[PDB]
RNA sequence: UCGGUGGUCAUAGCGUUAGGGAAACGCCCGGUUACAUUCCGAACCCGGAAGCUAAGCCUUUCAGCGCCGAUGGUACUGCAGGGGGGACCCUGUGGGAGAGUAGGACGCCGCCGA
RNA sequence: AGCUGGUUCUCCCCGAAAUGCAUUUAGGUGCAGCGUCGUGUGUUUCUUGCCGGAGGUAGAGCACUGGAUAGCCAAACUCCGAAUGCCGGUAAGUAGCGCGGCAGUGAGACUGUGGGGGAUAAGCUCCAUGGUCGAGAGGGAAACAGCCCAGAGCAUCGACUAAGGCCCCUAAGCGUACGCUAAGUGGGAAAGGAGCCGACAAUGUA
RNA sequence: UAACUGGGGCGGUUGCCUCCUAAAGGGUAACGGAGGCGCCCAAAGGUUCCCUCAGCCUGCAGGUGUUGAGUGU
């Protein structure tokens, strides 16, 4: 029910973080902002 | 300290402010390097003292009872500017550079912002 | 027959029996009382048998108080069962009576009949008992 | 007033007291009126004969000094009944103290299955330390079931007043 | 000063009782040691009061 | 249906009064705040009390609540 | 002699009884803007000073409820022994409560400002 | 063969274990605990006094939860709360630790105390904390591994004692003085009844 | 073609968390006494600011109420 998602921003195209998120609660592809170590910036990581 | 009780009708202003003051004093203590900078906000004027809670003594102090402010032109907001300036001076004198501001329970706006800014431009680091 | 209508834990340890009574050593309600002299467990059956003895003997008038209540559960496993495999189900309800405890109380106009009724009860109990009169504090 | 000879206790603790009772003496302590407690040893037999009476006035022949005292609290063996400890309270001639007096009921209840319950074994009253009545007498004759006698229903002797609220029940009659 | 004589065997006594006797210097039945009257030694005697006899000597 | 238990956690006080400690040592392991952090004492993620500065451990009552304290 | 800020955390509290306005604190009257109300300038925020100690606050009486509380003893107990058919009971030496009693208590200790 | 049996000369020094975790594991084994030897350290070990600490057991109590006719009850109730024990400091008094070689042990028993299961059973069973046996000779309890006294290098035709005893068997008292027992109690037992009764199984006193 | 097991089989259990037994540090057994877990929340996380409940009494409002409510489980 709660699968493991892999976050990714639009620049580094490197899979940084993974997390749990209830599918039925958040069907829309989840998104937030993290610290990408390649980019060295606080960019936005759209769920893969 | 250990908080105070609640109140009913009258004395609710006093209790709520005091209860709020305790909330602020569970993370703001008067050290030796940076003392406390309590600021009481009454109806007439606004006082501000520099207390050392670890020792218990007070280092500096200023209010509207001093001659410099006692009687003059300006509303309260501009009247706190004098109080801010002196206490900064009376703190610089007795070897104080960095202090920890506390609201006293009342919100940070109006005079409390104005008093802080007047004290902050005089050298003290908040 | 006295049973607790509700008890938090059905299965309990054996109530220890060292020491004297915490309290209830003196006549409180009635004029005469039964004071224990040795420890024992008094089952709800034993209390009932004693109560009938006193009330039947006096036959009318007089009032009997039962100061102890059998609320401690004792357990017993099914017969001819080997050791182990859990604890048994409660069977007897016992009041942990220690030396000095005043168990039964009785008020009656006639002293001789009172003592006789009290003695008849004592022989239904499993400990040594003594008859005590209410001290005029 | 009862004259009793009393000696001073110097050894304290579990072992000392057990030896004292083994010698058939009752340890005691005399206190009151802001004085330092005086630790006493008492003759066991003379004590029990004296203490048969409630609130008996004792004149302690203490080391050639006579002092007035009243037994305030006494510890007895719960099973054997011999005295173990006495607390003696100082009282001077003519001062008021609060004491408990037993109530003795006079007369015979009205005929029937009526029973008398002593809700309070002893009635608390304040009385002069030297003129404490031995007991308070109550007339219960003719009473029926449900009838309850209040504290204010007790006919006190002159000089005695209640130390409890006037509405407290002392006696009751049960079916 | 205290003159301490051991009168009973250490066999059957607790381990700390054995060490108390050793610390006092006692090493068997009928052995003696002389110590100063100090709170430590009064305490050691009390711990093994059933295994030793103490005599006061100037 | 009995016979289940959770293996022991070894909670309790790990440094007692008068005990000299170095900064960061564990003073108390506990569930909830039976002891609150005092001067020079920090609270961990799981209520653990650890010294922030070297000193001697000392218990007390600050502001009406039992606390641990480190005295340099 | 009062206002601000601390420590102990009821021996301080609660209730009850008589009062106080010199500065101070507060009530207090208004919403123009900044600011705010799950709706209301009641609260926060803003600007003053008409009236007032009625309440808050401070002082004060009462041991009434609550609170604190010895000494002595007892239970209990480390060590060492006894007794009993058993459940268990007792003592020597060291330690020693809880309850209860006599009593205490209508707080105390700092720093500033008027 | 995780199994059974056997393994041969002597003396000197030290000297255990039957416990914890895990285990296709339970009568086996790995690691840790406990032994010994070498090497480095040197009082660091241990005992007692004092000092600084946290507690929630025994006891007690009803202020919370529950039971229950003003009096009461409670492993999973606590307004309270020791004695001990534990951690650290220090003083006095007399083994500890690091690094390596080599092990055995991991079937425990009874007795004192605090408990659980059992039925207010068991020479029962499972724990905690002492003692002895195990691996301990010698003296006592008639005999009687685990109880009381006591730790055997060897010799001794000397002495004093411990537990336990002192009429004869059998070493030492027909001891001195006061009092109790009439039942051979001593030399087994209950509720209960007025030292006694209650008292009662099988080879032969027993 | 498992083990535990008051012989073995039958029945039951096997990992983790909380309480009591557990003898006031820690640890401590039994096929001892009670229960839960194999998740959930994109906020039920972070921070800043603000508020105090349950219950009771009176006719949403008022008085009382310091923890007896709540704390995802």
């Amino acid at each position: 029910v709660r699968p493991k998602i892999t976050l990714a921003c639009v620049e580094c195209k490197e899979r940084n973080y993974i997390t749990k998120k209830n599918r039925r609660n958040n069907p829309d592809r989840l998104e937030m902002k993290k610290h990408c170590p390649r980019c060295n910036a606080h960019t936005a990581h759209r769920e893969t | 300290a250990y908080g105070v009780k609640i109140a009913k009708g009258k004395a609710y202003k006093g209790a709520a402010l005091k209860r709020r003051h305790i909330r602020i004093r569970k993370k703001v203590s008067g050290t030796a390097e940076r003392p406390r900078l309590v600021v009481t906000r009454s109806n007439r004027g606004i006082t501000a003292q520099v207390i050392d809670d670890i020792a218990g003594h007070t280092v500096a102090s200023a209010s509207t009872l001093d001659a410099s402010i006692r009687g003059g032109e300006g509303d309260k907001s501009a009247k706190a500017q004098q109080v801010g300036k002196l206490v900064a001076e009376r703190a610089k004198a007795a070897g104080v550079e960095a202090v920890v501001f506390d609201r006293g329970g009342n919100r940070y706006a109006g005079r409390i912002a104005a008093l802080a800014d007047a004290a902050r431009e005089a050298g003290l680091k908040f | 027959m006295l049973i607790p209508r509700r008890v938090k834990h059905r299965k309990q340890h054996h109530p220890k029996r060292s020491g004297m009574s915490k309290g209830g050593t003196q006549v409180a309600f009635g004029e005469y009382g039964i004071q224990a002299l040795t420890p024992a467990y008094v089952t709800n059956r034993q209390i009932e048998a004693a109560r009938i003895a006193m009330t039947r003997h006096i036959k009318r008038g007089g009032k009997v108080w039962i100061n102890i209540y059998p609320d401690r559960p004792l357990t017993k496993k099914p017969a001819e069962t080997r050791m182990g495999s859990g604890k048994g189900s409660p069977e007897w309800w016992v009041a942990n009576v220690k030396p000095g405890r005043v168990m039964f109380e009785l008020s009656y106009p006639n002293e001789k009949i009172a003592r006789e009724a009290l003695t008849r009860a004592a022989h239904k109990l499993p400990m040594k008992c003594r008859i005590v009169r209410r001290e005029a504090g | 007033e009862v004259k009793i000879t009393a000696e001073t206790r110097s050894e304290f603790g579990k072992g000392a007291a057990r030896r004292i009772r083994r010698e058939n003496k009752v340890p005691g302590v005399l206190y009151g009126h802001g004085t330092d407690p005086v630790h006493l040893t008492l003759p066991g037999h003379d004590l029990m004969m004296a203490l048969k009476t409630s609130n008996v006035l004792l004149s302690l022949d203490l080391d050639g000094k006579t002092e007035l005292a009243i037994p305030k609290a006494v510890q007895r063996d719960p099973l054997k009944g011999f005295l173990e400890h006495v607390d003696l309270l100082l009282v001077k001639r003519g001062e008021q103290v609060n004491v408990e007096i037993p109530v003795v009921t006079e007369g015979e209840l009205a005929p029937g299955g009526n029973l008398l319950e002593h809700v309070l074994n002893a009635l608390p009253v304040e009385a002069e330390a030297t003129h404490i009545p031995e007991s308070l007498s109550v007339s219960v004759a003719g009473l029926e079931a449900g009838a309850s006698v209040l504290a204010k229903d007790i006919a006190l002797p002159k000089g005695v007043s209640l130390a409890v609220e006037a509405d407290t029940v002392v006696l009751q009659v049960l079916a | 000063r205290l003159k301490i004589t051991q009168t009973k065997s250490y066999i059957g006594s607790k381990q700390n009782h054995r060490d108390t006797l050793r610390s006092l210097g006692l090493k068997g039945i009928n052995t003696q040691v002389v110590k100063e009257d100090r709170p430590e030694f009064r305490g050691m005697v009390h711990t093994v009061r059933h295994l030793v006899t103490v005599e006061e000597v100037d | 249906r009995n016979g289940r238990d959770s293996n022991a956690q070894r909670l309790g006080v790990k440094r007692f009064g008068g005990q000299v400690v170095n900064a960061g040592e564990i003073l108390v392991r506990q569930r909830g705040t039976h002891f609150h952090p005092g001067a020079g004492v920090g609270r961990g993620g799981d209520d653990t009390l650890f010294a922030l500065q070297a000193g001697s451990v000392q218990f007390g009552t600050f502001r009406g609540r039992k606390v641990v304290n480190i005295v340099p």
Side-chain angles (χ1 to χ4, degrees), chain D:
Chain D
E1 211 165 290
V2 183
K3 314 202 71 63
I4 190 167
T5 187
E7 293 83 3
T8 197
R9 185 154 83 242
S10 179
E11 312 305 9
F12 302 103
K14 181 174 73 175
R18 284 211 210 121
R19 174 161 31 270
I20 288 285
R21 304 194 201 52
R22 204 141 70 221
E23 184 178 1
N24 189 359
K25 304 302 191 43
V26 175
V29 64
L30 182 68
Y31 54 70
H33 293 346
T35 62
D36 263 8
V38 184
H39 302 116
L40 277 297
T41 300
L42 297 167
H45 193 57
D46 291 331
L47 183 65
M48 61 175 278
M49 311 305 327
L51 290 177
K52 274 203 231 193
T53 310
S54 66
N55 303 319
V56 67
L57 187 68
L58 310 156
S59 69
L60 297 171
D61 202 359
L62 188 153
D63 303 77
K65 185 183 287 185
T66 300
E67 293 207 355
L68 290 168
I70 193 66
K72 175 92 191 283
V74 298
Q75 293 184 330
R76 304 161 101 90
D77 196 335
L79 209 58
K80 254 82 161 173
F82 44 70
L83 292 167
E84 271 185 339
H85 201 316
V86 183
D87 291 331
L88 298 173
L89 183 67
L90 293 174
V91 295
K92 304 332 161 173
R93 299 294 296 164
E95 74 194 350
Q96 283 324 310
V97 290
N98 62 6
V99 295
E100 297 182 294
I101 298 154
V103 181
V104 176
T105 61
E106 190 276 331
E108 171 175 300
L109 290 167
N114 296 331
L115 291 153
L116 186 70
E117 183 179 2
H118 290 254
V119 182
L120 281 153
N121 290 318
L123 189 68
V125 298
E126 62 86 20
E128 181 146 280
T130 81
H131 299 101
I132 297 169
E134 300 66 350
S135 179
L136 291 169
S137 165
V138 183
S139 186
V140 295
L143 294 176
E144 281 305 79
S148 62
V149 182
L150 271 193
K152 74 93 181 183
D153 303 328
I154 318 294
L156 296 173
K158 210 179 186 181
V160 183
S161 59
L162 282 71
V164 65
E165 294 186 348
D167 291 331
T168 301
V169 299
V170 55
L171 299 169
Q172 183 144 30
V173 176
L174 312 163

Side-chain angles (χ1 to χ4, degrees), chain B residues 24 35 43 46 52-53 65 87 118:
Chain B
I24 297 169
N43 290 318
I46 190 167
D52 202 338
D53 308 317
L65 271 43
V87 65

Side-chain angles (χ1 to χ4, degrees), chain F residues 17-51:
Chain F
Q19 214 156 9
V20 185
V21 300
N22 290 318
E25 293 180 353
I26 307 284
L27 304 178
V28 183
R29 305 211 91 150
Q30 57 170 341
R31 284 291 101 80
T33 46
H34 183 36
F35 295 96
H36 285 269
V41 165
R43 214 171 150 221
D46 68 28
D47 292 331
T48 300
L49 302 183
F50 64 95

Side-chain angles (χ1 to χ4, degrees), chain C residues 4-6 8-9 11-14 16-17 22-24 28-29 40-41 66-67 69 71-72 75-77 83 87-88 92 101 128:
Chain C
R5 59 88 173 173
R6 174 101 160 111
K8 184 132 61 193
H9 302 142
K11 274 132 181 173
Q12 274 184 31
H13 297 248
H14 291 184
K16 64 213 271 173
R17 35 191 162 281
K22 294 187 175 191
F29 314 80
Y41 304 147
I66 297 169
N67 282 141
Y69 190 80
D71 59 359
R72 313 301 272 300
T75 81
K76 204 192 71 53
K77 291 177 70 68
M83 311 276 318
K87 203 153 151 83
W92 318 287
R101 192 51 161 299
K128 305 192 91 93

Side-chain angles (χ1 to χ4, degrees), chain C residues 32-34 49-50 53-54 57-58 104 106 111-125 127 129-132:
Chain C
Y32 314 110
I34 301 299
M54 301 185 278
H57 190 61
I58 61 171
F104 299 88
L106 189 70
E111 177 166 11
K112 164 192 301 303
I113 298 314
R115 263 162 180 71
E116 291 206 0
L118 294 172
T119 300
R120 274 151 141 80
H123 295 168
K124 303 322 201 263
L125 301 173
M127 74 291 291
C129 295
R130 204 171 81 280
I131 308 194
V132 295

